[model samples]
Target: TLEKFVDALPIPDTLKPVQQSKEKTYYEVTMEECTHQLHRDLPPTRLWGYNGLFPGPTIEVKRNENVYVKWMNNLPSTHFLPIDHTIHEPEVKTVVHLHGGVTPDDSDGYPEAWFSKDFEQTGPYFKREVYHYPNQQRGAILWYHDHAMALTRLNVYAGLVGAYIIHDPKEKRLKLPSDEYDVPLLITDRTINEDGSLFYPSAPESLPNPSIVPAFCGETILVNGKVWPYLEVEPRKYRFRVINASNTRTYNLSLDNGGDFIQIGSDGGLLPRSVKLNSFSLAPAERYDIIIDFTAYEGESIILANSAGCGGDVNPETDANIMQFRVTKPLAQKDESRKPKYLASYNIRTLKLAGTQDEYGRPVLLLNNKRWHDPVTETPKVGTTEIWSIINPTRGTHPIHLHLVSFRVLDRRPFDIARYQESGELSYTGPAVPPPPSEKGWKDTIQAHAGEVLRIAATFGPYSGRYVWHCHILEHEDYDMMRPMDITDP
Candidate 1:
């Protein structure tokens, strides 16, 4: 068995622009096949990474700082991961998607806008070589990852993900952690063989060879590319940008030492006020910005623990332990970051997380029961506020994410799934409940629980174009659980 906390946590390097100026900044990131050691006891594990590095590089930009990135694919023609031809065909194609970015259509990383290595061949929706990021939105914790049609799960699992942080000068006055004090924790889970190769499971025997599994849950947990690593921290307050990069797992994280996390931000940006919580749940693609103070526990070690289960309950030895924080580092300088009690801080959309059985008795998941190629029915005009009521009758929870704009979650109410499915009528099983304090701010990803109706409001606009909204679960997403959302203009 591998030992926990044997390695120091790796802080992904901040990417530097290839061409910079006061007016605009340009960057070029290429996808490449690479190798890295996930654990100290394991040999190098092969992976597909951005710029030849796992977790790629953290991209930092100023708000509204016109940015352009030419995401190029340089991997081999053949993919190391299994591809289910029935789902979609691919020859090692890829497209970089900047999650939570307010971007235009061509630069939004549409599912079909993929390209093979070196742009030798492109998908049907491929339009431009370089993508633009206006960074017009507020400062938030954003990320970039693969979004190839039908290959998102495989490509992202192969390791094509990175962090992109937007910094607004207005927030600097808040005196939140800055420079090295502010860190990003990109979490991913994986199963590894003895030979240091990745192990992705296939579907049941009923399906043909190389069939995609409905869901996946890895045996081991990783933080910032290291397996159960440890981070030495100073005796002060530090800001952590927590991103759940797992494919199909959701982690309910808490400190084993019974500490609290001061959550300052969410997927879209900073919250209206800091929420002190004992624990928080993070689904795939969800981002939480928190502040952890270690002033009183200078000589103590706390385990960042997970209570949520995957295939089964979290094992006390493996899946439960995310990482370790050793408060042994002497303060480099006096703790200057403030944990302020105050902070400065949408449309109605209706949708559904419906599922049914296929001819072969396999499960099929979808958004509004529509496939990826279905006609675009969700059309919101520019600057229009709409309410979305997402009803989920599935067996599990899904993290629903929208592109281009952030929305406010109104409330949720339990409904009778059987009645709703059979007679197309809603029978409330419980009263409408407002969102918790943690969810009272801007959000690009919201959790729609099973057998419940989640109501949210968002105004679609600024720049109108083709975007997407789908479950963040890569498995369901690739298996036709995604839909295109067009923000039209009059």
Candidate 2:
């Protein structure tokens, strides 16, 4: 069963402070729905929001600072997005997970810890909506979004997502870019009805039904809530923290003018070095920390576009221009020698030899092969390196993410589709290319393209517990594409 609603919501301004002197800081976050006129023609429609906006305010903090956030929900007993009670619902609960934060078990936003309006009836596993973020990791581009079981997609789609950045002054000393120069481009795609209302087809047959049976999306591209938005900039270096928050769309982002982009960081933050690329692929929930030097073009404009194929559960033929940037003037600063080098560093350890006795491999996806369950077929000893080969048989690329530990991309090569289709010969195209600039560093997620076999080396690390590894695409994850693994000491 799905519930539909119409209402107006207001946008509230939020302020997040970083306690520089102290190692911990407290943040108060409130979730409520208010009335606001987004468009002049349409009557104000009520929408659920965090701090009064579809995408809440960006919370900027520093690495190693414990973040304490108190989340309060103050809305009527109604949801804005379509709630599938058969799969997931807000009445069942709400919980927030800072996507890439490395924290303890209790602090990790458990889906079952959701609560309802006025906090009257709470989930049994509810501890406290006030969360403690043990920021024991490096700086990175992380997002906080709703993770309440089946309703996650709905809640997030209804504007329950925001950006969280952990900064390091040492990296700031690198002088890459600063405020006003750095922009957080939250990119997403949405389809709207002719009446100007958001259109999401939860079922297979909505109106413009496609051949695919899985849930997909519409044609309109939106960046930070605006359709084909544009930004004006000077001919200087601008840092863009691009997040692909789409439900299932994979964006192969490139400049329309074919200008190279310098990728300085990834989901986890500053790569050891920067990679100059003309295009990069971003799966859902994946983040890319990049800097584009418009210095070459004193006066030019570029449209950030997507070139990836759309063939997943969503629309298989979707493509469009996302956003535009107009370079107006010359460089404001003359500092041209600063380059992006690795600031925050971590070591990549190998857990096991590729052919070691304990080293085992399994196909990543299970729909066309088998279903996912939690019996635990493979267990790794703490502090051991294990090699896992992820193979994607589908046409869509998946951002394979592992929890509890960060790994390095060992190699990615084309898998033989024809051989596998005919004689079941599993062969690769060639040797693995060295990881790109942003990917050479520690990463919890990596994009595995279609018919590509990605091998990753990861250590089970000191923490021994149950953690999950899955496609970061929220829609795929909601569709049961996620699996959990356990770690223990031998």
Candidate 3:
């Protein structure tokens, strides 16, 4: 049954440490093409990586801090993955985007802001290999990945992805989880051939006629580089900052023994209050701050499993458990961290249906039903609440993320599928289901299920400039399923 399997594996390492001081810090990163064996006893194959690791280094920062990162590319000109230049391919010219961080427009890692091998063929806005990040948002779980236009999915699949965390001293003083006790679980799914080669379906055809169908992922679940990983733990409370970095998978996570999780935070950071739940769903690029108390079941074991279907054309073995955890003994000493009644203080933006400025209201999917182009859409006033009704006409689930602003999922209800299809009339099934416990707080991303209408109330409080809001899935984002949003105030 493979109840418990323990194997000695080398812990993945990170780049040399860059000190964080003053409000600004310096970081240097090198992108290189290297050979990596997907599994042991397999012939080494080529893959692109940051610092030569599958999943790159963990970037740690503080709120309101300025960071300077110098990125260098030392790889060859040829791409490891097949390219459809007619669609878009920014491999030879690659750039980095610290997803979820509120930085300047230039540092926002535009697709056109890519650079080549040496610094010879550079983009128009390419300054130095160095990037300056003015971390102005709340502490949250952010990530860094290749943002090179059409090749984003391929590059990230070849291994250019990592974790980024922004810390606040006041939050640290809250006596929450820290150090060895607090762990960042980078959960992803992949499929390897019998020979241990990573597999991704090709472009299939030429561009403009490109394959628009989504590439569903593999069966093997990997947590921090380990397939079906296991974590040994003492029978105490542990904080698991979970990140769903999957390409197209949505994980409905729960404990095998039917245990509950105390969720303390969401993607943007600590919640207003912790909420307990037995199961939760995390879409691509989403984060959850959860505290699991193992003391209740001392001397027992629990397997963390994802029971949701892959939800696309490709379906791996269903009903598989991803990772396991064995609860051993109690903590060496009594833990005395106060369970705060209130985590953060924020106001809820309220607006009535009649007060909507969308008077000439086009279909929710339409700013007059027009497809998103290079220009701007609905811009909100600074510090004001703007309601967004996201109407999903597609059949699959979509995780929507907006840059430089945080929002609350007000409600979601099922729309009349038949009516919308026949008469193009939108009708709600019932009252919107409120967000989950962890999601009751601020969020940078929200997942809207198929045939559902998701509405969000957001405050545009950060820098006023051109930013983007799109599907959190890298593949979906690259396939032109994104739009640009500009924030302007009178």
Candidate 4:
């Protein structure tokens, strides 16, 4: 039954420019509800998608190009999932957020900047419908998702996700992989209902109760919105841009037959050199740029599975699976395994914050014990390097993600939590450890382990805007784990 359901993977259609010019390009996207077939076994599931396509369409552009997008909301009046009104609820209202784009402050998709269907009602910080994005940074794999206040978790779960790729001549010269061979894997997990509708928990966990903390882990995992989907590959090297789009799940990706993943880039862009990893864990909204050679496994099948353990309340039986690949076609063209050692030539920047919990009750996770409305303390000067030392005092791991810029992991060391709580002192109990080779390049999200202080450096420049950094865990971020990052000109 499972083998028969092994359908071929489908790449998302590239969105054509509605209007293009020498100065800037324009686009219009409609947010609405649709019926999608996630698996052949299940019925067509009722979900929301951009332009009626699940996972939406890929938007590809060049470096330094300006893009203006009209994100129109055509969703229904009421929301399908449970709403916790105490947390300020309105599912119909939404704003588009380019996860890694260096956008202006007003166009940064402020959480309180959502508007309803037909612009009937709006959030407190509701901005205009037309959002502008400045593609000033280097080429990287970015994604667009919902960033509404208290509604992001359910909204994103019902689809409303897509890819935004920026290209550069420097990366094209390397000729790593392009065109049909290069693919983007938008991976996610979802739970289904008997009537082919999406299943989201309606409990306090689904609600905004900090006391009854819960995470939504789907019973089935989907890649490109297909269940255990398979892709045919030629006997050659292929570039895979993998994004973990799940709400709470984490993936430790690996090949079945001991295959090597030559990671050439990360969330930001290409690495200085390729780092071969046996397997690596990816949190929600995280990305990995890797090269997989199919020549060795021709005429064989490979399963791309997830082995990472869920620290929350998720089962691995259904949630652990990702996607599959079948080596069928012979090489149509010769391929080289050669790649540049050094990828980017840019300066570096740094900041050190802590992931903390005020108490054990309702609304716990926080950034340096500061709320979202707290005064701006993480203001980085323009065109400079900033290193951030993020100390995690919580028990569970938090996936700290930054917007507008990608960071390079510096190191991770165990810190003295008890002493730091009582007296403001810096004491370490263990040596600083380097991140995996796959993590050596540019990144937007990294796991800050329970007892460690994760260090990462980002060069802030190109644009000055008010963005944000928060835990990639959708539920945690909604409660109180996010903060503002203002980039000011020095």
Candidate 5:
């Protein structure tokens, strides 16, 4: 058995731009194939990472900063992960998508905007080399990952994900944790083979040989690319930007010591008010910014525990624990980071999460039964406010994500799934319930539970271009559960 908490938690260094000025900032990140040790006892695992780093590097920028990144691919011509030749074939293609950035169509990392090494071969939508990020939105925790058509899941699982932060100077007055005290927890799950190689499950033979699995649930959990690592913290307050970078797992996290987490920000930015949460569910691509005061628990060891399961309930010996935090160090200085009660003040769409089995009994998940290449049916004017009601008839919760805009969760009401599946009519099973305090803030990825209709309101704006809306589960996404959303200007 792999030892737990044997390695120190690694904090990814903040990436410095190659060229920086008051007007524009430029960065060059290369997707290179490298090997890194995930656990002390196991051999190094081969991975494809940005700039040769497993979790890449944490990129920090200020609001309104004009940032340009030339994401280049330097990996070999072939992929190491299992690829179903049935899905669109690839010779190691890649495209980097800034998950929640309000970017122009050319810079949004559309799936088909892929390119091979040294720009040898390009995709249909490939336009420019340098992707621009006009950081006009509020300060929030965002992420970047691979979005190549049909290869997103494997590319990301091979380690092409990183954290991107937009820090607003105006929020400095609130005095949240800063500098070294603020950390990013990029969580990913993996299943490793006996030789310390990555294990991505293959589809059943009934469909196609080496096809994509319907879903994935890793046996081990990783934080910042380490297996069940530990961190030694001072007796002070620390801010944590939690990112769920897993492909298809939702973690319900809590502290074993029964400590509370003061959540200050959601996906979009700082919330209107702070919320204290004992535990919270973090789905794929969702981010939560919270503060944990270790002042009271000095010299104590606490385990960040997980209750939610992937394929089944979390096994106590394995997936139940995330990481260990030891608050044994003395105060670095006087604790000054304040958990302010008031942080800051901050769309409609009717969609359906439908699924069916193909002739070969292969599961096909879709959004309104549309494929990624389907002509744009969800076209909202550049500056129009709209409400989207997402109806989920599946058995589990799917994290629905929309690019280019953060939305507000209005409410959710239960419906008769069997009735809706058989007939086209809807029958109400419960009254509409408003979102809780934790979910009242702006969100880009939301949990659409089974047998419910989740209503959200968003104002598509800032830029008029092409974007996408899909389930954050990479498997489902690659299997055609994604759709193109065009924001047109009149």
Candidate 6:
């Protein structure tokens, strides 16, 4: 009963990335062990974090800008958490993946290219400590976390995560909630032991074998890095760039008092129009830039609750509500801005099915039903607009995310998987239904539910190299749910 039990806590300061001069936007972070008091008045849990802080720093950058980061690993010789060498064989390895970034291949922080302890030893594809990010995409909310091939699930649990917000002059012209009112709310989940120690069950039940199929879910939810935290807000519209940083949990976020949210952006960037919704489903590694007005209910506390039924053996009873917001302050400053009717625009491109066999052939799944090391099947020509139908015949929904370029979800429809499996033909069970208004924008990831087909239109260009498309669920991505995608010169 965190909504009824706790008072509002002070929000953390928004961290700004440093700069050496004008073009040289510099960022240096190291992974180190620290004792964090996750729960109030509880013993500190020793965990690894970036720059010795949980949920690391917030990095703000301009569109089409360049950044250089010294992604140094400063952990102990041995890993404190359990390790399953079936996925990877890192002793104390770590590397940063610019999630949703159109970075070059070498700078992409490919899973196998990790480093440890000031470059004493490195993974196979380890290029340099100074990683360069060519931020050539639209203004959006990106994230950085451990991308070690097999150890991402374990390392991210230790708190090696942070937010990267991209800015643009066009978005600024809209005059949304500016300055301090615009904030990044990093949400995650964790299970702490009685002594305030980090609890990730290593038993066969919680920790599956080499497969690591079911991603771990915690009992208590965390915004930033606290258990059931709350924030006080003024009775005004505030733009919140929410990031779902959980390892394996989905949240259908909404206000308890039936407050609506004006969703302005998705994983890639701003939408063409504002989307009004009572709630939206947020999956792992997905970012939703939303604006919520607290003016409707001043002096009352509203809890942001989650009711997404992501059926992967997770308990909805325990992980119910997220952080609460207390609309306590009166309107002092002039509410000069409002949600824009026309925010931005982009040309609709050609539609072409991805050069996938449905990856298309699997009954309960698709795409070779394959492992991580499967031969690269998807090789698209450079500067091509293709409509790829990501089919998820699996048991539950999978947040399918692609690298290099952002895509737009066209529509979803029910299908007969049994018929398709028997005969190599697509039989529709229902007409196609377009995405919700909030989802009609540039997105790098889309959820494909069971017995349905999720179609996406991708304009591949800007970079030509090898990338990947897979389930964003860290555990599933580590297993057979992932595959390689290479973009070649046409």
Regions of candidate 1 where Cα sits further than 4 Å from its true position: 346-349
Off by over 4 Å in 2: 1-14, 17-21, 34-45, 85-92, 123-125, 205-213, 311-319, 329-337, 341-373, 376-382, 417-425, 461-464
TM per prediction: 0.98, 0.82, 0.86, 0.91, 0.98, 0.91
Better by TM-score, candidate 3 or 1: 1
Clashes of each: 13, 13, 1, 11, 12, 5
lDDT of each: 0.91, 0.66, 0.70, 0.79, 0.92, 0.77
Residue clash pairs of candidate 3: 366-369
Residues 1-490 of candidate 4: C-alpha lDDT, one tens digit per residue? 2332266787999998899999999999999899877777777888889888889999998988889999888999887776666543445778889988878778888887888887778887777878888788878888999998777887898798988898877677687878888899999887777767787776642334323244666777788888779899998889888988889888888898899888888888887777777888888998888889887888988878777666544344455567778898778888754555666654333333454443443455677677788898788887888778877766677888887778889899998878877785658998999987777777888888877878888877677867788998987887677888888975
Please provide, for model 3 over 249-360, each residue's C-alpha lDDT reduced to its tens digit, 9 standing for 90 to 100: 8888899899998888898889989888899988988989888888778878788878677744322333356677878755777765545657888833221111111222
Tens-digit lDDT string for candidate 6 (173-260): 7989977788788888887878888877664332234324355677778887777777888988899989888888888888889889
Candidates 1 and 4, the one with greater lDDT? 1
* TM-score of decoy 4: 0.91
TM-score of 2: 0.82
- Cα lDDT for residue 289, candidate 6: 93
After superposition on all C-alphas, the RMSD of every candidate to the true structure, in Å, is 1.2, 7.0, 5.7, 3.1, 1.2, 4.2
TM-score of 5: 0.98
lDDT score of model 3? Answer: 0.70
Model 3 poorest 10 in a row by lDDT: 350-359
Off by over 4 Å in 6: 1-18, 206-213, 310-317, 347-367
Residue lDDT tens for model 5, 136-184: 9899999999999999999999999999999999999999999989999
